[PDB]
Design a protein around this ligand. Structure first.
Ligand SMILES: [Zn+2]
Ligand SMILES: [Zn+2]
Lengths: 117, 117
């Protein structure tokens, strides 16, 4: 496996994790929607029953399908909504500050409620 | 209660927690071994059956009893051993960096093994 020892709490927060979710995804090489390229924007593998080419984003929630070899993920989600406060974040897990880490927990839980109400 | 939403994993890491452990402890006012004064060094309430005046330290393990109104906790533990890498740490939970947070987990688990072997 080769993965950290973090609980299910803030697992998705990890980059490797979001990338592991990607099983196949045709958009790999020669495309701006690669596993690591997309996961870096919050998008996590979540293909539907009929629409396998559907990549949704966590920490905000936003289903997006019909990608092409030239659709920046970070710009995609943000373009529709900046629900992901991590998009801008450019500091490794062990680089950012705790204060910023916890602050995220509030955002995630916040977005979840938005879905309902 | 008024306490964060952190799991049992790294609970003691919190200052308020280490302080909450202190039930009574005579050394409160007019002493250098107050609840907040000691907890700041890693010492957590842990009175024995016969020796209620015994304050041990976590993240290192070190039983110390027979305190007096002039025994710096941080200097006490360190004096005998610097098992607590947090002693020097002077940054609030949301102040320090993640890298330093995780690095601690290794120390704690390390000290635990030392006890056995
Ligand atoms: Zn997102
Ligand atoms: Zn200690």
């Amino acid at each position: 496996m080769g993965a950290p020892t973090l609980p299910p709490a803030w697992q998705p927060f990890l980059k490797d994790h979001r990338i592991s979710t990607f099983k196949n995804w045709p958009f790999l090489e020669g495309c701006a929607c690669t596993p690591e390229r997309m996961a870096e924007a919050g998008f996590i593998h979540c293909p539907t029953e009929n629409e396998p080419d559907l990549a949704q984003c966590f920490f905000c929630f936003k289903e997006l399908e019909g990608w092409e070899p030239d659709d920046d993920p970070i710009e995609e989600h943000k373009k529709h909504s900046s629900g992901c406060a991590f998009l801008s974040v450019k500091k490794q897990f062990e680089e950012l500050t705790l204060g910023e880490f916890l602050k995220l927990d509030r955002e995630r839980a916040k977005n979840k409620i938005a879905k309902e109400t």
